Amino acid sequence: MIKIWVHIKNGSIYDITDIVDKVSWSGDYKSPSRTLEFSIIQSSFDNVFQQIDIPIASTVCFYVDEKELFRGMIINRSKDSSS
């Protein structure tokens, strides 16, 4: 059981676990910060698969077995038109 929550600037909070496609969590001993990478399914061709937008510099929280392991800021965002 892994849950991902996102806090947006206006005050809205979303649970996006049903949309996530892949998750990665890592760290190294020569840097002070850990990193989290994830992907969601969003299609512009199909109206059904349009989702919410998550702007840069919004907080994301990562839970495993009802325990919070990661809290951080969103830094990069990318969208490919083919996929």
Binding site: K30, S31, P32, S33, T35, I75, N76
Partner: peptide, 23 residues
């Protein structure tokens, strides 16, 4: 063109690591 894609990925990784801070 493979070298260009590899270089692009390496540059992106290095920039992310620079932002994160390296000892």
């Amino acid at each position: 063109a493979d070298i260009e894609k590899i270089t692009s990925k390496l540059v992106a990784s290095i920039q992310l690591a620079q932002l994160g801070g390296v000892l």
